[PDB]
């Protein structure tokens, strides 16, 4: 898939926003996605343990690993598509070490959208959004390519 320059500056212009709390934002979506698929909450061995949301809002070990997971994420948006080198180790650990099935990201794109959508919304409008969608359609089906060739796949 390739996005136009526009898309890209849609998608660009409200990573903006993010980038002035990316504690905040991180925190955001992660407890969206752990509350929307507690599934996923058993793939962190760190985190496993938190049973209610405000456990979840108190844990400062959380809040790091969104800074952490929100710099990945910008890093790779700011390459407009040319985030090969970017990706490849990010694949590796999620496939081999981590063993996230493929479907999961597609729970975070979700809880990303979301919140962008709840704390953005005159820079989150429709065109905006189908924009963003595209950038994390074109990011997961990379990944799941990797994971392909790393043994994965699923
Ligand atoms: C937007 C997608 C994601 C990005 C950019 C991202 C990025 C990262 C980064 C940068 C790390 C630390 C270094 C590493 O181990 O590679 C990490 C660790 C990890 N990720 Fe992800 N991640 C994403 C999605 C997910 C999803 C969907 C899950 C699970 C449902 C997941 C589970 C984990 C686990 C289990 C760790 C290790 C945490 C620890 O105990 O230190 N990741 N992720």
């Given at each position: 898939?390739?996005?136009?320059?526009?898309?890209?500056?849609?998608?660009?212009?409200?990573?903006?926003?993010?980038?002035?709390?990316?504690?905040?934002?991180?925190?955001?979506?992660?407890?969206?996605?752990?509350?929307?698929?507690?599934?996923?909450?058993?793939?962190?061995?760190?985190?496993?343990?938190?049973?209610?949301?405000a456990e979840m809002?108190?844990?400062?070990?959380?809040?790091?690993?969104?800074?952490?997971?929100?710099?990945?994420?910008?890093?790779?948006?700011?390459?407009?598509?040319?985030?090969?080198?970017?990706?490849?180790?990010?694949?590796?650990?999620?496939?081999?070490?981590?063993?996230?099935?493929?479907?999961?990201?597609?729970?975070?794109?979700?809880?990303?959208?979301?919140?962008?959508?709840?704390?953005?919304?005159?820079?989150?409008?429709a065109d905006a959004?189908?924009?963003?969608?595209?950038?994390?359609?074109?990011?997961?089906?990379?990944?799941?390519?990797?994971?392909?060739?790393?043994?994965?796949?699923?």
């Amino acid at each position: 898939m390739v996005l136009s320059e526009g898309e890209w500056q849609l998608v660009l212009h409200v990573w903006a926003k993010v980038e002035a709390d990316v504690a905040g934002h991180g925190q955001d979506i992660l407890i969206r996605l752990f509350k929307s698929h507690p599934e996923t909450l058993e793939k962190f061995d760190r985190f496993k343990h938190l049973k209610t949301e405000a456990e979840m809002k108190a844990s400062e070990d959380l809040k790091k690993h969104g800074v952490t997971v929100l710099t990945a994420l910008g890093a790779i948006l700011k390459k407009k598509g040319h985030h090969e080198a970017e990706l490849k180790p990010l694949a590796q650990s999620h496939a081999t070490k981590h063993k996230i099935p493929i479907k999961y990201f597609e729970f975070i794109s979700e809880a990303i959208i979301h919140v962008l959508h709840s704390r953005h919304p005159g820079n989150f409008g429709a065109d905006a959004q189908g924009a963003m969608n595209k950038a994390l359609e074109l990011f997961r089906k990379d990944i799941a390519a990797k994971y392909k060739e790393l043994g994965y796949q699923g």
